[model samples]
Target: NYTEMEGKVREATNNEPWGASSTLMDQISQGTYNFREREEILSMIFRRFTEKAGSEWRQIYKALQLLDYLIKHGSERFIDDTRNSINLIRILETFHYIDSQGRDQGINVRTRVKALIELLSDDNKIRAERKKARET
Candidate 1:
């Protein structure tokens, strides 16, 4: 079981996207293991997003931030892994939320998701640019 790494993913993608532990991320990414273990942790993070049928706005928001961190700092290989995994439908013009208990959840998730969509599109465009450049 990826039980231990699953816990680490939680910490890295927890509610406080601000205090999200880089050390925890580094431990998971740079630990004593091969590509498979890292991908396991990556999948754990991917599942944290909203496609799973149940997840709050805060969790999805934090997951987005965690992914941003991964693509930026984890490794060059991570970007492709993400592009292959993330669902475009989830990020496009969706993310409605409401907090019944008032602890969290609101309309902010739309802006956040939109921001992620923009970032992903930029990466896509850049990759496409490189492809055309090479072809020409």
Candidate 2:
């Protein structure tokens, strides 16, 4: 039982020596990089990093850095790291890790980011609705 789990996590990831795989690229190309898949990608990235860094805290930093890149270039930039799904989770995870040194486990960065995205999206929807209402 232990033997199977031991290497399975590592097996799923593709690092520098092994080179990037089509898995990440395929996800990006399909535009199926949703919240659930993003979580899995983040988990895998942290686990892989743990093999080298001993702690995934660094992943938080990586996630935030990814967000900055996404903000600057948008989701299309992630084509380069196709196998890896980039999104707000990385940014929030990093903030959660660094802000309190992982003390506040109650906060879910993914949820917060989603809420913000929803709010901004709703603002646009409301504005459009108002414009239509006025036209009517």
Candidate 3:
């Protein structure tokens, strides 16, 4: 009935350091996208990350940003979001990460900050937060 709605989300993802994702996040929280369409959104997102972001440095931040917003506000469905669609674990290379671009610190420092901010987000509970938790 309302398939094209997803593309609007795609087009609107400006990918800024902290872009304006609230519109889509609101739609996601409202359940406007549904499972199938939501999954497609996930796929499109992962495509941008993996096809380039994962291997490189540029848009990875923005890529992950929208994804994080999805998981954050989109809730458990978005967390269980991908059905393991991406080996998202691999993204850890963001800061303390990488085969990286033959060592370009210009981009490298951002990876560290990027990784730091990212890890502070949803990534905690899995390996990082638990390990940090156990130490307490």
Candidate 4:
């Protein structure tokens, strides 16, 4: 099953010309389906891509980029859905795995993580302001 899944990933990634591996990333990013309904698919992709981080740097890069885009584009309601479903442990573990991969792959995981943190912080700030306005 893992081999089958890997084949699917390889096919999805290798078939692209312009975006290349970014194909899957773009597909998941643009869809209009409610994220809550696609939670399982998202979680699976996130987890699988995180697992690939240990061996393939591009996978990790795109996966984090996907998360970054999600946080930036997703609404506060969707963020709540993410909080309720995504496994933080898997994300942290992937970060740890990438740290061990060193800094030669042209992919700076630290910068990506920092960007993600800043995005989340800004989103939280917006949420807080909205909450305060509602309370007033």
Candidate 5:
């Protein structure tokens, strides 16, 4: 029973890969108990996947899945964070080590990851948008 396996994600929080493994193991072992009754449970786990994992890139994938599900199912609780969204896609690009085109000869994944993190950071936006907002 998941009764024993379930708890606050904060307590179990750790590295990204470890968290991903734990999440997958928990989900598969318990079989989700009841699919109909587990919507919130699933979403909560999905949130945990990102928050606790400290790997927004993987979280991005889960978020996109949730986003698509919400778009189709129409759920009120569906929440999307900008940071995770950006990180996920960027992470995917990093892991895959490829670009939109089928070209391997280009900017590397490390560079992209750094750039993505900066673009998603709060400070850059404040600096970049300060002048634009005041100009009008």
Candidate 6:
């Protein structure tokens, strides 16, 4: 699905704007790219983003957008990636820290993170139920 979506983007732009964002997008869209490696890199970027967000509000937007994209398009490999788990907790903790400072953006990011976590939980629940059904 991501490959198809990326194909359309590539077609529309003729693969122009070949910068960091484009490179990342291309790598993620490719079928052969290593999902674990991608998740690790994304996790690192997320940590850096959160660490800098307090001083640079724009980083919040960048981080959220990246999270959203990964959540929507990533496979089970992304979820299983060890670095992803660590960075997700770090992001959640950072959100709490930011909220304590009383910034509106912090509140927004926290809410979104909560929703994402809920989605992940639901996904796991469904998978477990399917496994149980298969066992029966």
Scored by lDDT, the top model is: 1
How well does candidate 6 score on lDDT at residue 76? 52
- The positional error of residue 40 in candidate 1, measured at the CA in angstroms, is 1.1
Summarize candidate 6's per-residue lDDT along 1-136 as a digit string, tens digits: 3344334333322223422273564455342247545644454545545465544444454455444445445545654552346545445544533444565666655666665565555667546544564485
Residue pairs with colliding backbones in model 2 are 24-82, 24-83, 25-82, 25-83
Off by over 4 Å in 4: 1-37, 83-103, 124-136
Candidate with top TM-score is: 1
Query: Please, what is the TM-score per model?
Result: 0.68, 0.26, 0.54, 0.52, 0.25, 0.50
**Which tens-of-lDDT digit does each residue in 7-108 have in candidate 5?**
322223333444334344444324334454244344454464335322233334433333333222332222224344554545434443233466542234
> Could you report the Cα RMSD, in angstroms, for every candidate shown?
6.4, 12.5, 7.6, 7.5, 13.8, 9.2
Q: Count the backbone clashes (under 3 Å) in each candidate.
A: 0, 4, 1, 0, 0, 0
User: Tens digit of lDDT per residue, candidate 3, span 16-125?
Assistant: 42456566566754552477766666666666655654344544555565565555455456656553544553554543335555555335535544553454355554
Displacement of residue 39 (Cα, Å) in model 4 is 0.7
In candidate 5, stretches whose alpha carbon ends up further than 4 angstroms from where it belongs are 1-80, 84-87, 97-113, 130-136
Question: What lDDT does each candidate get?
Answer: 0.62, 0.37, 0.52, 0.49, 0.39, 0.48
The residue-by-residue lDDT of candidate 2 on 2-79, one tens digit each, is: 232223333333233243233534332233245444444445544433342223434333333333222322243232
Return model 6's CA RMSD, one decimal.
9.2
Instruction: Put down candidate 1 lDDT per residue, 1-136, tens digits, no spaces.
Output: 5577677777776665558776776676563245766777777766766464224666666767666655555554666666676574255356555555653354555676666556665777546544564485
